[PDB]
Write an enzyme that holds these catalytic residues in place. Structure first.
Site, PDB file in Angstrom:
ATOM      1  N   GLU A 235       0.814  -1.255   0.000  1.00  0.00           N
ATOM      2  CA  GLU A 235       0.000   0.000   0.000  1.00  0.00           C
ATOM      3  C   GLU A 235       0.827   1.276   0.000  1.00  0.00           C
ATOM      4  OE1 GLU A 235      -3.758  -0.136   2.326  1.00  0.00           O
ATOM      5  OE2 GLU A 235      -4.052  -2.107   1.349  1.00  0.00           O
ATOM      6  N   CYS A 342      -9.627  -8.781   2.652  1.00  0.00           N
ATOM      7  CA  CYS A 342     -10.351  -9.147   3.880  1.00  0.00           C
ATOM      8  C   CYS A 342     -11.729  -8.473   3.954  1.00  0.00           C
ATOM      9  CB  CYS A 342      -9.521  -8.886   5.156  1.00  0.00           C
ATOM     10  SG  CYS A 342      -9.080  -7.137   5.460  1.00  0.00           S
TER      11      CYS A 342
HETATM   12  O1  LIG Z   1      -2.273  -4.044   6.909  1.00  0.00           O
HETATM   13  C1  LIG Z   1      -3.472  -4.212   6.115  1.00  0.00           C
HETATM   14  C2  LIG Z   1      -4.759  -4.204   6.988  1.00  0.00           C
HETATM   15  O2  LIG Z   1      -4.532  -4.939   8.204  1.00  0.00           O
HETATM   16  C3  LIG Z   1      -5.997  -4.834   6.294  1.00  0.00           C
HETATM   17  O3  LIG Z   1      -7.054  -4.986   7.238  1.00  0.00           O
HETATM   18  C4  LIG Z   1      -6.619  -4.052   5.129  1.00  0.00           C
HETATM   19  N1  LIG Z   1      -5.872  -2.845   4.800  1.00  0.00           N
HETATM   20  C5  LIG Z   1      -4.605  -2.896   4.112  1.00  0.00           C
HETATM   21  C6  LIG Z   1      -3.367  -3.152   4.992  1.00  0.00           C
HETATM   22  O4  LIG Z   1      -2.292  -3.567   4.112  1.00  0.00           O
END
Ligand SMILES: O[C@H]1[C@H](O)[C@@H](O)CNC[C@@H]1O
Ligand SMILES: *[C@@H]1O[C@H](CO)[C@@H](O)[C@H](O)[C@H]1NC(C)=O
Ligand SMILES: *[C@@H]1O[C@H](CO)[C@@H](O)[C@H](O)[C@H]1NC(C)=O
Ligand SMILES: O[C@H]1[C@H](O)[C@@H](O)CNC[C@@H]1O
Lengths: 497, 496
Positions: A235, A342
């Site tokens: 990200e 997720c």
């Molecule tokens: O660390 C991750 C987060 O824990 C995940 O819930 C969704 N958001 C992107 C992030 O890469």
């Protein structure tokens, strides 16, 4: 071999309960004889990947919904399916008794389970960690003299990975991704918040960070683990936003381009790890195709980039075609790969909803839409979490296909586990997605693939409440007469000769 | 005439403090001669719509970015700007002492403030209510004999609206939107959650619901208030979501299509309220163009739909693929932003007093909207308390004015002035026109033509760098200026 032990937590469907001595498992896979099909069914009402078989009919009239296979319409090949071995996942798995740990790992990695063949591994801490650390926390250590793996790797992550590879049906591919660099490489000197690499691509902060990937890989190799690929950064857009709450490292697409070109590509290319693939982006698809253009129209960065990695989290406000489809249109030879998903989702619903059928459908819905738009693989986020959806040091709790209850030496397999399973168990690396056209507008989601042995696999998801009768045509073979029950997912397999 | 009293609360910039005896305000506008321009400037460093003036001269001394007015390229005409008089906004305004209330209402509606000319009015309760209620809670009242306005309308919303209109420099239009029907008309028998109207377009449930719109318009008309428009339902897609937490009424696009065709359209048009516009969608723009294709390709429904209402939330689906595409497909059906709000990231803080970033989000999205044919822009709650409430479910959202009941004071946020850079100077009837950038730049800019022929250009700088700027009017000459980092300007000049 052993059926699901169901339990309700008052949501739409049940979970399957496992402990030290029991877990639902499969028998070894058998070839359906030519002229027959295999069906695997999971239902909201409680069926969990039940095996059944039917005949393939030589003829069909009239009548209603027909989905026709197009073996000549050939699309992407499949890299694979899996999840992330985060600090939080590993910690939870190992808190179980050894016999429960094994049933847990077999459920994901074994032929008696769902045959995962990808594991994502964070390079040092992320939000699903219980402390912040990088591998080189000595300030201004440009030579990385104090680079080391902490216990999170040497006592939790790495041993768990070994045991998965040992159980593994298929060759397993490791993918690595950094959330943050050491804080002394960063303009804000903190693991979180808005900030990027100091200075400019080509310089010492940039070269050190590139070298840190090499050291990470060198260290994993000492423990006999080889990586299939790394991402340029998890990200990158996140580190651009002030007050960003957990580990991140900001790159504009221009910064990533030049970082790849100047430092990360050449450094990796000159190391013993030159075969490790590099994937770019590793972020929400709403950033495509812009990000791919900035980076891949620069041939100095393009020559180092194998693939583009995408995150699923919203997503819902960026239609596949405009993102995934466009990018493939422009760079057909750069694979798309889903590196993180997720649920989710939602702000009024708990982090963990034990037994949620809806969350299962979101997985398979997304996996199908991904496959339909060229994506070569899919990677869930945390492999296991606790009933709170942690631990997580910023409390950024989410759901996971397996939920561990440490007080009860027990784990729960959610619907997401099975919905994933309908793809992971039956689509091996090397499968090629093929055409599948519907004779009339319908409410189903479906995808067809060709197994590397020549066989067929079709996944049909029914997110409506109504049964939908249907036939699948394969010219080589005939007709599968079948019904898709409301709130079900089926995978269909059959030989073609 | 009265300047901002700044106060910091630890965020990027300041609020303006107003109370019973003091609020920041403007003098009446003037009409400077040809060859002079007026600039209103707000900066993160603290300036709040400050007025200066200068020359537009025949010679071009700047060397950097050039923006050229192109009045010959004519786009959409503007309907207007405003905000929502929710239960919560009304309660917050009404907890001020009377002279404070007036300063607040003037800030938004008066020539001395920012010239709002739209009010959105919820049809009964929504999440920004302190209770659940509809206008017809008595079960099985299919003729709606027991339909009526509670105190929230007759004591809170309606008096405030009358007063806002007394103050307003411009004609104000009202826009109404329902969140839920009476629960005995719904499949789920609840105010919230996954549930639509019972039965099917055409039947007793649909007919009753459609009549409820008319009863609402009658009731407000008894209060001497007429509406410009109604939306067919606030966020129809929300009510398709299991467990949706607040007041909703689900429609698929087909269901909305058929309800408009069979029930809402016919009933509105066979009433004394036949001139009220009907706006469809009233939801996130990601639902476009699809929702527009489904509703608007059926001539039986299309003949009743004046416009497509969009919400900005939830935007981060691109403008072109949604607004741009929807205009291409249906170029004679106006696009209108019916609800805008921020919109807190999970690590925030629904209310951030003095946030410059949220300001910039408003003006940036207003500019994007104008560049993609949108005719109007409605903020959400007119005012909230410092907890971003009252809200019976949960607070997520900031507002341009924050009321502090305990100190008889209210705070004007950067959002308020960012909206003002537009609403104050773009009256109904204004037309968007060309503005050509000579080279790639980081500014956001838009030009419009006032009904009296004069130019209005808004220039937003979201970067930290000053940007040297020349604006050219082919009819007048060149205006030399600088757009400071983290600022917003509005430029005004006469063209003859
Ligand atoms: O660390 C991750 C987060 O824990 C995940 O819930 C969704 N958001 C992107 C992030 O890469
Ligand atoms: C394990 O699960 C099965 C339920 O299938 C049960 O009969 C057995 O007692 C359980 N073991 C423990 C320790 O609870
Ligand atoms: C209201 O604001 C003005 C200007 O800040 C100030 O002089 C006056 O004291 C304020 N009233 C109260 C009660 O503080
Ligand atoms: O009731 C509205 C909310 O209060 C607003 O915050 C966001 N949009 C969703 C709803 O239409």
């Amino acid at each position: 071999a052993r059926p699901c032990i169901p339990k309700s937590f008052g949501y739409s469907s049940v979970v399957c309960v496992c402990n030290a001595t029991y877990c639902d498992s499969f028998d070894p896979p058998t070839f359906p004889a030519l002229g027959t099909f295999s069906r695997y069914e999971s239902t909201r009402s409680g069926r969990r990947m039940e095996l059944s078989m039917g005949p393939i009919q030589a003829n069909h009239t009239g009548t209603g919904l027909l989905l026709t296979l197009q073996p000549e319409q050939k699309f992407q090949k499949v890299k694979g399916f899996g999840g992330a071995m985060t600090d939080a996942a590993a910690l939870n798995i190992l808190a179980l008794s050894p016999p429960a740990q094994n049933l847990l790992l077999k459920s994901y990695f074994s032929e008696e389970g769902i045959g995962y063949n990808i594991i994502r591994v964070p390079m040092a801490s992320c939000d699903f960690s219980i402390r912040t650390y990088t591998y080189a926390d000595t300030p201004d250590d440009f030579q990385l003299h104090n680079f080391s793996l902490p216990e999170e790797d040497t006592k939790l992550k790495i041993p768990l990975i070994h045991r998965a590879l040992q159980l593994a049906q298929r060759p397993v591919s490791l993918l690595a991704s950094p959330w943050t660099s050491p804080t002394w490489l960063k303009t804000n000197g903190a693991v979180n918040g808005k900030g990027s690499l100091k200075g400019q691509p080509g310089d010492i902060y940039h070269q050190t960070w590139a070298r840190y990937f090499v050291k990470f890989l060198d260290a994993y190799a000492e423990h006999k683990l080889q990586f299939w690929a790394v991402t340029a950064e998890n990200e990158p857009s996140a580190g651009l936003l002030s007050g960003y709450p957990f580990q991140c490292l900001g790159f504009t697409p221009e910064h990533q381009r030049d970082f790849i070109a100047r430092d990360l590509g050449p450094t990796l290319a000159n190391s013993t790890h030159h075969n490790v693939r590099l994937l770019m982006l590793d972020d929400q698809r709403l950033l495509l195709p812009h990000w791919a253009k900035v980076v891949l129209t620069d041939p100095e960065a393009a020559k180092y980039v194998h693939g583009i990695a995408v995150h699923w989290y919203l997503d819902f406000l960026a239609p596949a075609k405009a993102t995934l489809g466009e990018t493939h249109r422009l760079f057909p030879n750069t694979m798309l790969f889903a590196s993180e998903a997720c649920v989710g989702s939602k702000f009024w619903e708990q982090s963990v909803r034990l037994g949620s059928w809806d969350r299962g459908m979101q997985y398979s819905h997304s996996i199908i839409t991904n496959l339909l738009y060229h994506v070569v693989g899919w990677t869930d986020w945390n492999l296991a979490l606790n009933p709170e959806g942690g631990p997580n040091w910023v409390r950024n709790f989410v759901d996971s296909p397996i939920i561990v209850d440490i007080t009860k030496d027990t784990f729960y397999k959610q619907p997401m586990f099975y919905h994933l399973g309908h793809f992971s168990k039956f689509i091996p690396e090397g499968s090629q997605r093929v055409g599948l056209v519907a004779s009339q507008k319908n409410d189903l989601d479906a995808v067809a693939l060709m197994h590397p042995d020549g066989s067929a696999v079709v996944v049909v998801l029914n997110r409506s409440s109504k049964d939908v009768p249907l036939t699948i045509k394969d010219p080589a073979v005939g007709f599968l007469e079948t019904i898709s029950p409301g709130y079900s997912i089926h995978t269909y397999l059959w030989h073609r000769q």
